[PDB]
Amino acid sequence: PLSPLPAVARAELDARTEREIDRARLRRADNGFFRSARDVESVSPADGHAVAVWWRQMTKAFMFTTLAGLGALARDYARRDADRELLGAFQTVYQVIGDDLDNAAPEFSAVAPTGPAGIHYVWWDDTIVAPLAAHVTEADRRAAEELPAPVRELLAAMDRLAAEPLGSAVQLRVVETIALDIAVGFRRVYGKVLAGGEPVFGEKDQFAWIDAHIKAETVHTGMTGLVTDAERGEEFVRLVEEYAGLWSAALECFGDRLTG
Amino acid sequence: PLSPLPAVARAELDARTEREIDRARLRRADNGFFRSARDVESVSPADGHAVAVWWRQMTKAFMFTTLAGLGALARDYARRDADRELLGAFQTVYQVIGDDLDNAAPEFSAVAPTGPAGIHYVWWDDTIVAPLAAHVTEADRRAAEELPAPVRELLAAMDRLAAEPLGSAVQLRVVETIALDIAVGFRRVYGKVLAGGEPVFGEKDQFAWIDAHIKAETVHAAQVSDDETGMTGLVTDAERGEEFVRLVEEYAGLWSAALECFGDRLTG
Ligand SMILES: C/C=C1/CN[C@@H]1C(=O)O
Ligand SMILES: C/C=C1/CN[C@@H]1C(=O)O
Ligand SMILES: [Fe+2]
Numbered sequence: 001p002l003s004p005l006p007a008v009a010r011a012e013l014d015a016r017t018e019r020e021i022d023r024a025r026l027r028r029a030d031n032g033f034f035r036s037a038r039d040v041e042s043v044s045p046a047d048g049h050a051v052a053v054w055w056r057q058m059t060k061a062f063m064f065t066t067l068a069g070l071g072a073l074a075r076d077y078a079r080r081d082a083d084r085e086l087l088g089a090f091q092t093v094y095q096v097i098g099d100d101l102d103n104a105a106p107e108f109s110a111v112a113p114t115g116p117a118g119i120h121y122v123w124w125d126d127t128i129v130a131p132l133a134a135h136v137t138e139a140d141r142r143a144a145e146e147l148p149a150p151v152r153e154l155l156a157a158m159d160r161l162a163a164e165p166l167g168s169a170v171q172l173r174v175v176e177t178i179a180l181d182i183a184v185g186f187r188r189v190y191g192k193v194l195a196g197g198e199p200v201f202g203e204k205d206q207f208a209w210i211d212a213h214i215k216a217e218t219v220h221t222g223m224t225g226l227v228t229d230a231e232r233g234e235e236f237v238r239l240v241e242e243y244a245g246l247w248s249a250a251l252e253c254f255g256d257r258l259t260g
Numbered sequence: 261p262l263s264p265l266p267a268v269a270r271a272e273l274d275a276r277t278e279r280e281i282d283r284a285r286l287r288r289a290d291n292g293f294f295r296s297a298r299d300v301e302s303v304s305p306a307d308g309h310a311v312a313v314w315w316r317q318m319t320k321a322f323m324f325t326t327l328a329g330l331g332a333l334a335r336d337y338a339r340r341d342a343d344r345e346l347l348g349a350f351q352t353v354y355q356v357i358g359d360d361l362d363n364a365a366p367e368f369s370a371v372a373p374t375g376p377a378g379i380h381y382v383w384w385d386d387t388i389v390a391p392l393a394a395h396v397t398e399a400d401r402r403a404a405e406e407l408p409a410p411v412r413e414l415l416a417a418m419d420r421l422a423a424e425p426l427g428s429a430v431q432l433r434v435v436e437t438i439a440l441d442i443a444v445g446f447r448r449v450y451g452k453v454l455a456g457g458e459p460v461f462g463e464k465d466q467f468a469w470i471d472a473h474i475k476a477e478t479v480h481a482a483q484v485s486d487d488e489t490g491m492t493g494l495v496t497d498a499e500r501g502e503e504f505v506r507l508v509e510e511y512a513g514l515w516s517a518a519l520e521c522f523g524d525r526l527t528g
């Protein structure tokens with residue numbers, strides 16, 4: 001006795017989940033980050049650096065708090081009989097976390113560094129943040145570490161989901177929806193960073209983190225498969241609404257930084 | 261501002277660790293389960309089934325509580341800033357426990373069923389418990405689910421290490437050391453289970469779970485003792501390391517008693 005909801009109640013949860021993402025204005029043509037990334041003629045080192053620092057911290061927290069949420073679910077399953085449908089969905093979350101922690105998918109391990117240098121927030125720090133940091137003053141660099149409030153609110157939302165047995169499903173459900181558009185926006189943003197009139201990212205291989213995410217998302221037991229009763233279903237939709245809105249406000253904050 | 265202990269102080273913790281494993285009597289020649297598995301001549305369907313049920317629940321709890329311990333460490337790392345050598349040993353936990361959940365390593369991915377049927381406690385249930393179950397009575401299947409006290413005490417400790425930031429490191433450092441001996445014990449024991457006159461497990465493929473473990477668990481033991489990306493590489497201060505040895509003692513001890521419980525059931 002433990003199993004997913006029937007496939008009809010689950011499909012309704014998926015449709016309500018898609019509607020929360022619509023209402024949060026996270027779609028490609030909605031969110032100020034994707035619009036700005038398309039619209040701006042150029043991007044200063046300071047602005048690109050700041051956005052890169054915020055992203056580094058957001059993706060580090062996304063990965064660790066998603067794994068923590070999986071652990072919370074594992075605590076439960078240690079003392080229940082999860083059926084095989086449930087276990088398949090648990091495996092999926094594990095496999096997906098593995099992309100960011102160890103480049104599990106072949107599209108990542110074909111280009112990412114091995115060992116801890118390949119952890120996505122570290123690989124980002126090494127190849128995106130550090131070259132930008134060479135073109136900003138030490139005072140600029142300390143200011144960027146002072147995260148804006150919408151970024152702090154999102155990290156606080158992730159800390160709360162780290163304890164939630166549905167937390168890893170909520171986070172992956174939303175992030176996988178928007179990951180493609182974020183990575184395309186980064187490709188465009190850092191393609192437009194000029195320092196000495198010369199591009200800061202002038203070599204193809206410097207975009208390897210971004211192009212790998214674009215490739216993986218283009219090609220890439222779903223997340224509602226971890227919902228085991230009606231009350232959890234309601235809780236899932238509620239956490240998706242909160243989490244999606246915080247993501248949208250954090251990306252609007254990227255967009256704001258690139259404009260005005 | 262987070263890093264492991266210096267190499268010297270770590271290889272010292274590694275030595276105190278291998279010594280608590282010694283004292284615990286978990287070595288190939290000191291634990292009653294490994295001796296009995298080799299020594300006994302025959303094992304009844306009912307006795308082999310009972311141990312198979314116990315092992316199912318023990319390994320199920322090991323995987324999930326070790327995963328939960330990794331989650332509790334992740335929750336810490338989301339707040340702090342772990343240097344790369346810490347992150348490296350973190351990756352090892354994810355990689356090692358990942359085989360029980362996903363059969364990533366090549367020894368397993370060849371033979372393991374795909375998807376959830378390959379989860380190791382499920383694969384054990386399907387290929388060891390179930391064939392035995394067909395040769396025991398309903399009352400035997402009921403009685404085997406009521407776990408003996410030494411097994412329950414181990415499970416209860418895993419439930420506590422599940423919320424411990426050092427919990428995955430403790431459990432993997434001990435279990436991966438003894439895993440090979442346990443798997444070799446099971447190969448002996450379930451070769452000697454006879455029902456109706458002849459063995460329950462006749463074909464070589466019926467040992468797939470055990471055989472794959474005998475091969476793979478050599479490298480897993482080497483992964484948890486590696487002096488760069490090994491389990492003591494997750495210890496960040498001298499106090500934490502003291503807690504590590506306290507918990508390894510507790511855990512190696514409960515693992516030894518639980519395994520002796522297997523041996524007694526096999527002998528009488
Ligand atoms: C934060 C979401 C992401 C998809 N994997 C990306 C990363 O590593 O940043
Ligand atoms: C319990 C320890 C083990 C090594 N992996 C084995 C299993 O799945 O049982
Ligand atoms: Fe990633």
Ligand SMILES: [Fe+2]
Nearest residue numbers: 359360380473
């Ligand atoms: Fe295993």
Ligand SMILES: [Fe+2]
Nearest residue numbers: 436439477480
């Ligand atoms: Fe192992």
